[PDB]
Amino acid sequence: TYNIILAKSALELIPEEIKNKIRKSRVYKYDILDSNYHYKAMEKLKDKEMRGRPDIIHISLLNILDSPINHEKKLNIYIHTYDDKVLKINPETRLPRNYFRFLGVMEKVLKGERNHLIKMEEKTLEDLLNEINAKKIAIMTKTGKLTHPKLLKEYDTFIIGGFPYGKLKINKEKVFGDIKEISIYNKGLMAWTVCGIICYSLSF
Amino acid sequence: TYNIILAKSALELIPEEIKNKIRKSRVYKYDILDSNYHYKAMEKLKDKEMRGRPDIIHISLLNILDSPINHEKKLNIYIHTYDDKVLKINPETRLPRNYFRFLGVMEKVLKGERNHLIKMEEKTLEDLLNEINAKKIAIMTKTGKLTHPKLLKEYDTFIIGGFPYGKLKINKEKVFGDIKEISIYNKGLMAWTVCGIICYSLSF
Numbered sequence A, B: 001t002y003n004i005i006l007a008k009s010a011l012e013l014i015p016e017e018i019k020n021k022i023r024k025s026r027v028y029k030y031d032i033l034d035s036n037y038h039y040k041a042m043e044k045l046k047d048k049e050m051r052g053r054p055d056i057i058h059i060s061l062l063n064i065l066d067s068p069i070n071h072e073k074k075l076n077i078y079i080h081t082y083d084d085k086v087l088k089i090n091p092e093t094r095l096p097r098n099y100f101r102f103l104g105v106m107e108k109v110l111k112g113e114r115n116h117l118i119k120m121e122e123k124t125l126e127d128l129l130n131e132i133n134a135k136k137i138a139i140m141t142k143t144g145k146l147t148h149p150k151l152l153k154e155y156d157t158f159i160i161g162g163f164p165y166g167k168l169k170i171n172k173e174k175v176f177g178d179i180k181e182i183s184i185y186n187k188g189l190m191a192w193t194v195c196g197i198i199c200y201s202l203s204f
């Protein structure tokens, strides 16, 4: 089995520090931060540029869940979020293709309501890696060593930033497994594209 | 270069036939057919099972446009629609990640408004194929010959159905190029996944 982790993911309930600037509307009734609707209220939010993008997770998970490697039951799928929650995604999850329906599902999960296909825990990325016994970890970043996707099969765990901008920071001294920074392309790609490339590298 | 075509795509303006059954509402203010919102009015629409799924085109294009093969300018991208409109998508199109924003853009294109990156013409699939000089054509379908993605490089043109249900049918006597039915997996996959696998097979 392989672990795929979308980490520091821009999928959060509205931060306490800006709750007073954001109200539910008919246009967007969800308690999930989305910079398409909430940009001005995020003005003074820490790391604002890498937060409030649930759509990245939506499209990435649509790719992952429908991949041949996932149909073969060879993936364990995790969303680690900016505020250290971990969602474990059952391989047979039928994720709504409608963005707002996706938000409705995720909102309930993040508020601690039981979902039999998506399990939520408070958990750091480093703690997740150790708990799943990750040993050979590939951290995906454009700044990494350029690797033909053919070699990705040598790793047990893949980490992709679930955010638009910046670089994934991890405390390697808190992680038991070995971490290698890997690039699969000379250009910055979107998280869903990287997830897709990894997934199809594993089948083909 | 390669041609990638999402064909008989479920992306259309609301058909005149069913406008008397559509009640306009402020939750969905677009003139694009979407079964999420129009399911009742579509009850006696011809081919309703393969229509009104613009989300399939959104996700597929998000994958195609960010693929390495597109960043390298080795793709010509076309959307052929259920009602025989053809959109030529400039490789540098910055497609909205927000679904409703996507629908706003597509609505104006389908209504004939000028967009320097997305060019619309009234055209059948067979005429498109001939006019771009498609030579070795792979029609993607789970009912075709099972093929390793490494062999896809031997084709210049790939056709994927931009719809949720049904099979792509083409008039052989109307196409100059050679058409072959190609399956890349023994299970039905979503259009976006097939698009992803093709693009990545061309890059790697």
Ligand SMILES: Nc1ncnc2c1ncn2[C@@H]1O[C@H](CSCC[C@H](N)C(=O)O)[C@@H](O)[C@H]1O
Pocket (backbone or CB within 6 Å): A139, A140, A141, A142, A143, A159, A160, A161, A162, A163, A164, A165, A166, A167, A168, A182, A183, A184, A185, A186, A187, A188, A189, A190, A191, A194
């Ligand atoms: N060229 C590339 N090679 C490997 N991984 C990449 C990549 N481009 C983006 N990624 C992955 O996709 C995630 C989101 S893209 C986020 C910004 C990106 N780190 C940049 O500087 O451009 C990244 O965190 C990384 O995990």
Ligand SMILES: Nc1ncnc2c1ncn2[C@@H]1O[C@H](CSCC[C@H](N)C(=O)O)[C@@H](O)[C@H]1O
Pocket (backbone or CB within 6 Å): B139, B140, B141, B142, B143, B159, B160, B161, B162, B163, B164, B165, B166, B167, B168, B182, B183, B184, B185, B186, B187, B188, B189, B190, B191, B194
């Ligand atoms: N296993 C597969 N191999 C190649 N192409 C596939 C495929 N599964 C789906 N596709 C493509 O994705 C499009 C939409 S999926 C539509 C229904 C699908 N043909 C089925 O019966 O299951 C199809 O028109 C086809 O072009």
